[PDB]
Amino acid sequence: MRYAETGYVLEVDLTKGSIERVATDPRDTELYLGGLGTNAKILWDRVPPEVEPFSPENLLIFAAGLLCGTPATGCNRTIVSTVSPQTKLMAFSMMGGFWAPELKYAGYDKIIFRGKSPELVYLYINNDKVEIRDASHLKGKGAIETAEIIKKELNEPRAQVAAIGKAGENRVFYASIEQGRSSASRGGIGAVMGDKGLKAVVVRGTKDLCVAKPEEYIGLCNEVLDYIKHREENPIPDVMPILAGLGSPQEMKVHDEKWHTENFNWGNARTRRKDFWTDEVSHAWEKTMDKARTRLISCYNCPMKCGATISMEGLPTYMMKCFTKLTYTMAAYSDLDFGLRIAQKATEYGLDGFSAPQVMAFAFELLEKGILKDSDFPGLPEGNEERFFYLLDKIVNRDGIGDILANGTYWAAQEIGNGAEDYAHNNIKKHEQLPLKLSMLNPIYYLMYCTGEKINITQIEGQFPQAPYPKLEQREAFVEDWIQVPDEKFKKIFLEWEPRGEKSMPNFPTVDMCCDIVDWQEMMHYIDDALGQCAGLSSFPLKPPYHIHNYPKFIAAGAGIEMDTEKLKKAAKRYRTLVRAFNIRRGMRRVDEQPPANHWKNRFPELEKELLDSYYKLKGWNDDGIPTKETLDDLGLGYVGDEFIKRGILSA
């Protein structure tokens, strides 16, 4: 029998209105683990490159991670996968909360949506009872609001609901999918969901979820918990609070917003304010936050409570985590109050909190320079904040200029012309990045920005420290108990790393070192995104309770398959290179793998080229960024190579 996973998925054709449960192949589990991996396997041989993002042939997949529904702390992530309407590449997006485990309790590992429903509908799941309900009465409603209405209707207060807002219905290229305190944010998967006419997915599950080796698994869980306790009693020394503990960036818990408001770039990732964090600003923000933060809350089976309920006066309560707290503020040169207020609207609408404020700031820059006229903004108010609310509504409705901006900064700039492309200066592969423009080049982050398939810097970094310690004793004390490292060398590297001197950046660490680091970090992220484990307890923070040493034990005792460290490494490499191959098949080359021109003030071309080359070589790819026939054969991906040669992507 199958363990940890359920062994079944749901095939849903929205056009024909057909629902079918299909058993999965355990070999696929042994090869690609699950979640993101098996998602990629599905997309590979069911979505050819001729398929458009808004075509019925495109697939929208909701995947519940392998170990979701097991006693494993924090393992609760949902992985949504499709073809992004913005990047035209593969889009996978992670959402936390309670949905994925609910799906596992319903007895399913994935839901695969194809075709398009002509009428707005939603999917109701309750164990073995699955049906498509009409949702025409929910048109335009917010995501959370929709969830509540549906739960009232179906009389299922304990049902988990993933929904889109109005922006999802109007196919905004950065429309999200919302569920409680959790969001599938980037990529534009919300746009795909809306395009298929799917308003929401409602799941209620009450079946059991078995594991292979009980006592061993729960022992591993207990070990994780104990390590969490110890890790909370001992944060990373001499490091700013938000980079010292476990979980997602604790932006909701009180900290020093000095480093944030003086390193992040305000406006359209433009202005840097070196002395913004005055006492007045600090007290005002602290006051607003104390008034607005109702409670710190957690995802399923986790004690970190990274999330928070936000209640602004005169507004419905919503939930928030991480940097969504800052972006809307920073992009508008406003205060925390404004940010919190507009984030409510944006969250109900279903918008990526990264791209949307950058888009609005971009538009206002275009108005400033003269590329866009006042005529392009019918009834534009005088006040700044008011202008942002106005533009927000214009975008989610695709009204006038909003219709263009809804396509993202890239496709907007290409349609507006007159030098609008110059102002879309924060994109990579047509995807907006963190409003962060550093000074001195960072090799590791160069590689990560360039190659990361998520096209988001925060969802690939983690296991290796962002900065070195000034003194050596600190480094020694830190590497002392650093048990998460795959090889001992990673300690030595961090021992040699210095802030200044000949052992500093960008010349140190060496190219090969940086390649190793990026490989490791990315690997941990891919493992997390396959197992359904929250990055907050693994790939993202320093010294996590989940690492490359105990993970194989978890997969073994949980799923009941053979697994060791090397097999796991090779698996991660396998479906990572598979995602890579998928992106290659849709036209991506080395050309597209470049950071924004102004991303750094200090660039070093001969170092960058060597970095990229060495990394390609380490991944087992071409000089053009394409996986070689050999490495594909080795990773059991022969069919991929055969197709590559057959399509003329590789020479025979």
Partner: protein, 163 residues
């Protein structure tokens, strides 16, 4: 004097994670930890973040009948749910009942364990069980019968006893 156990529940500390449900169902599963199913947990967390309601509810006793009327509280601004605080395996809802058969479920504070699993897996520290001693417990019978007679009639009582 006998001994009683007070399950202290700090709803002001619970963060809604539902880990209690997980570990409880996990342990109370057959064989131990061979599965987990929140619907089989002796503790069920009343959860609504929009209302700022986070309340762990433990399983009490079994009743073969619903109340004639259901209570729906409003306290300190919070509009709680119908039968929101009731610990009973009552046939008016799925709570504290087997999701398959329908059978009732009761918490026994993990009879035969050092520390109750729901409490150990609550790293935030919202659940604490305590113990204390209290003095353990014919005219009342007679007065009760004389009370029933005056309400339903003597013949009715005499007929009800013999049936």
């Amino acid at each position: 004097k006998r001994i009683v156990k007070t399950i202290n529940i700090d709803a002001d500390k619970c963060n809604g994670c539902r880990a209690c449900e997980v570990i409880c169902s996990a342990f109370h599963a057959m064989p131990p930890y061979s599965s987990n199913n929140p619907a089989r947990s002796r503790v069920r967390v009343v959860r609504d973040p929009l209302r700022d309601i986070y309340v762990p509810l433990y399983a009490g006793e079994y009743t073969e009948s619903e109340c004639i009327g259901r209570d729906k509280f409003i306290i300190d601004g919070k509009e709680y749910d119908e039968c929101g605080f009731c610990r009973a395996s009552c046939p008016s809802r799925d709570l504290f009942r087997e999701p398959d058969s329908g059978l009732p479920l009761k918490c026994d504070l993990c009879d035969g364990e050092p520390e109750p699993l729901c409490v150990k897996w609550c790293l935030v520290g919202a659940l604490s069980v305590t113990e204390r001693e209290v003095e353990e417990p014919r005219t009342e019978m007679e007065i009760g019968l004389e009370s029933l007679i005056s309400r339903f009639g003597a013949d009715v009582v005499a007929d009800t006893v013999e049936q």
